[PDB]
Design a protein around this ligand. Structure first.
Ligand SMILES: NC(=O)c1ccc[n+]([C@@H]2O[C@H](COP(=O)([O-])OP(=O)(O)OC[C@H]3O[C@@H](n4cnc5c(N)ncnc54)[C@H](O)[C@@H]3O)[C@@H](O)[C@H]2O)c1
Ligand SMILES: NC(=O)c1ccc[n+]([C@@H]2O[C@H](COP(=O)([O-])OP(=O)(O)OC[C@H]3O[C@@H](n4cnc5c(N)ncnc54)[C@H](O)[C@@H]3O)[C@@H](O)[C@H]2O)c1
Ligand SMILES: NC(=O)c1ccc[n+]([C@@H]2O[C@H](COP(=O)([O-])OP(=O)(O)OC[C@H]3O[C@@H](n4cnc5c(N)ncnc54)[C@H](O)[C@@H]3O)[C@@H](O)[C@H]2O)c1
Ligand SMILES: NC(=O)c1ccc[n+]([C@@H]2O[C@H](COP(=O)([O-])OP(=O)(O)OC[C@H]3O[C@@H](n4cnc5c(N)ncnc54)[C@H](O)[C@@H]3O)[C@@H](O)[C@H]2O)c1
Ligand code: NA
Ligand code: NA
Lengths: 260, 260, 260, 260
């Protein structure tokens, strides 16, 4: 547990990030959440963190595709929390197309959010962590940080970048009480994946649940989705003392994707 | 936690394996321990598992360099425990020499224990796990399962083998409720490493603690040893529900060794 | 050999790229070269390709940190050559600083050139290669595409990105007669590295050649630099028929860096 | 080219090894071949190396699953050739079964040949290479040296072991003029694979060529087999000066297998 700890999760209004936020609050951390969505939904999430788990929670809206906005977000988060012990760099987007058709503006958007925001958020968080001699940076990469699939040039590039950046962060901070690791999930049935399921379903002329099975069968040997709650549990483990010497590495929760 | 669970740890009379056993018993598992040592020491360890943690504990002596003895060990362990939910394949040895000088009998001994015993123990455990639709196989590999160092041909080969075998085990059992993963530690200050520290100390004409620092500085960016307790905590995480879709992968606790 | 082939090498006015260009021309390819430098030097290089090797050579100035300029460069290159069989994405820059001090504009410049230019150049080249059913895309990544070092966040990220992008390119084009691979060199004594050598020399108060030895000793077990000519030979091999089923992979020429 | 060079290829009476031998002889090396088969066939192969390529060729029968026989084989090979510049450790076997059914004697046979023979052959060859300050050790691993498939526990373990051993060999010999690398092929249509094709064909009730397509489609994105001649060309490249700083690494010729 994490009582007393101060955590920030990017892209935590929904999906994996919301589950990360929830598991951290359940472990006793105060939490800054972030991301887009309907204002009434975001506020109900923020207030639920506080009323279920007895922590402080803050929502800071920032579009993390802008470098300065990300750096300012971290400073505001730290001010809200009174410190910053755990940063989860989670916000991300996807777009599928073959390379020769891949929109330039989608390349730029995915690099900006999925890769550069991790750099700017880390850069802003590190001096706070270095001053207190304790920190956790948890980057949400992907199985696509280690291997590739067709039609995902920007995302694969970005996620491979995140894995590299994680290593660098870990080595620069080696021995300082700060670790940096990349969680690399396989398929998790959030809206980011439901769109891909829907696309397969129209391509193949099949019901959505058949399409979900086809999506799994191609990549994920277990034939089951990874859950956001599992991922939250992994982030809680990374934040624990057992993981004090776990740094610069990848934690794959991928149902076997990368074993073959 | 693991209340009700039945665990076997090979090479658990001392070192990392003893800490694994201890963390599993603390989480509520009954435990079979194994390995060499003074009989009075081994019995005090066995009885301490029971009296501190309120579990059942058994010591089964088996030299796991013999295939049949390993397979018979698993059967006896399962009979003692009334089942087998978690197998930790930990027992291992080391010998350093350059390849052209590496004793053939040391090659054979390290392959037999560090690689083949993992295969024979898994083979014996799997049908039990397959019948109950739940299992954890946790192989203790090394950073030397992913990268190399000089003078460790047999050990590096073996540990790379263990990582491959882990993948295979995971894929054959994908979706059955059984996962298989390899913990890959960096330096942990057990007697296996203290011998290497002593060897450096004589080579360099320096005190043991200087030698320990030199051993770390060459490989492990954090400049701190991984602890057996950290490793036990990782094994407990691998046994948890959060790790239900973690299979076929490596969990590096290595102070940054593999990041560079 | 490559008689008849049409090759483009980015960042080929000096360094590794010039050697790539030279080895390709020696194998009989016509070559488009690119990059910055003194106009008289660039023209002597262009004319030397033609007069020593009896090929056609063209210099096209393009700043490949601009997406549209890269895409237009490829189109102009193809028009000059009358086709495009081999693309070597080589141009790159470096900047060293720890993350919290790393200039934002240097992050952006290194991502733009070292990662995004590979994407835009590939995207423009692919349809030409797809129409003729033969192509080679050769991306110059680095040992820093697979592992990290301190103070190189942007470059490591970018080069890891290039390795991911290489995979994607290879899978999208699998079986079409087009391969895509990443050459991953260790240290090569170009001006990009001589600046780092000079920096070590001032930090340590030592002569340049001592500093060059220290730079090698830390990373590169062979204690010798990789040469640009070796790299050119690797690119020629990748362009050969023996490499028709070599695709989506990395070719490390790194003196052992990534083995440990 | 390799005029003057002295090469040994294990398991070169047929398959990949025969093609390796042939490409080396074509490049001008004298060659020792090895392996099982009909005596009239083996002698026609030996004499053909000499009469087509104008080199000396020798057949030495040794069962390389025996350590001493392997070490004695190398000594006899060196005596026949008058030296030993290039060793290709190629001989291997396969057996498919799930782990719990995998015969113990097949585990032992595959570890002995596919892993331990590489160690014993390297150990015997190294002192010869160290004395002349030049050598090439080329280990034939597999895509199964980097990733896994079901029902191939022993082979995957062994091939992962070979990749580890390759690294160690390279680091111990770093800077001595000796390199060690692992070629990692995907599917190559030799008798080792034709048996697996036949097995699929009976499982699925389909013609052999359909079965060959299914075998490729599952693993190898290019949908085409790697050829033995391609592999021979890779071994010739590894033996060249361009590869003087290529050491401790893997060269994947796998049609994209490991990119996804
Ligand atoms: N779903 C999966 O299968 C899967 C697998 C591996 C990795 N991932 C990664 O997990 C992360 C979360 O994915 P998800 O599936 O939960 O997606 P999601 O689409 O469900 O959630 C994305 C979150 O990011 C926020 N966000 C989007 N653009 C933003 C911006 N510019 N600035 C700030 N916040 C922004 C969204 O509002 C939301 O909170 C992403 O990095 C994704 O790449 C997902
Ligand atoms: N110490 C480290 O730095 C380190 C790092 C990474 C991986 N490892 C691995 O962790 C495992 C445990 O190592 P350790 O450092 O605790 O070593 P250790 O020498 O302290 O303990 C080895 C244990 O194995 C037992 N054992 C030895 N031979 C056996 C045999 N033939 N049959 C049954 N049991 C036998 C010993 O009695 C003891 O219980 C080994 O697999 C080792 O490779 C260790
Ligand atoms: N030198 C090494 O040790 C080493 C090792 C591994 C990988 N690399 C990579 O090899 C590649 C070449 O490096 P190098 O050492 O030859 O460097 P270099 O500095 O000697 O040459 C860089 C080349 O890129 C050109 N270039 C720079 N900015 C450009 C721009 N915006 N547009 C177009 N061209 C531009 C330069 O004019 C020059 O031709 C880079 O991608 C580098 O990352 C180098
Ligand atoms: N065929 C493939 O798809 C493929 C792919 C990747 C790696 N490999 C590896 O390539 C190597 C050659 O495989 P192949 O497909 O050519 O197989 P093969 O069965 O066609 O040839 C095997 C060769 O090894 C010899 N051999 C077998 N047992 C031996 C022993 N005990 N001692 C000495 N020689 C012995 C055989 O006589 C023959 O010369 C093996 O290491 C295999 O693992 C093959
Ligand atoms: Na893979
Ligand atoms: Na490494």
């Amino acid at each position: 547990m994490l009582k007393g700890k101060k955590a920030v999760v990017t892209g935590s209004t929904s999906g994996i990030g919301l589950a990360m936020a929830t598991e951290l609050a359940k472990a006793g951390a105060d939490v800054v959440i972030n991301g887009f969505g309907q204002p009434e939904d975001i506020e109900r999430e923020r207030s639920t963190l506080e009323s279920k788990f007895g922590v402080k929670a803050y929502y800071l809206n920032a579009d993390l595709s802008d470098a300065q906005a990300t750096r300012d977000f971290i400073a505001k988060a730290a001010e809200a929390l009174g410190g910053l012990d755990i940063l989860v760099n989670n916000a991300g987007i996807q777009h599928t197309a073959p390379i020769e058709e891949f929109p330039v503006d989608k390349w730029n958007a995915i690099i900006a959010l999925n890769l550069s925001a991790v750099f700017h958020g880390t850069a802003a968080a590190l001096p706070i962590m270095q001053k207190q001699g304790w920190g956790r940076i948890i980057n949400i990469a992907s199985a696509h940080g280690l291997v590739a699939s067709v039609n995902k040039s920007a995302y694969v590039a970005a996620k491979h970048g995140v894995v590299g950046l994680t290593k660098v962060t870990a080595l620069e901070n080696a021995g300082k009480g700060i670790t940096c690791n990349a969680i690399c999930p396989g398929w998790v049935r959030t809206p980011l994946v439901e769109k891909q399921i829907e696309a397969i379903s129209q391509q193949k002329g099949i019901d959505i649940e058949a399409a979900a099975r086809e999506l799994l069968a191609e990549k994920q040997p277990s034939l089951q989705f990874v859950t956001p709650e599992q991922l939250g549990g992994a982030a809680v483990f990374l934040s624990s003392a057992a993981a004090d010497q776990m740094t610069g590495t990848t934690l794959s929760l991928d149902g076997g994707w990368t074993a073959r």
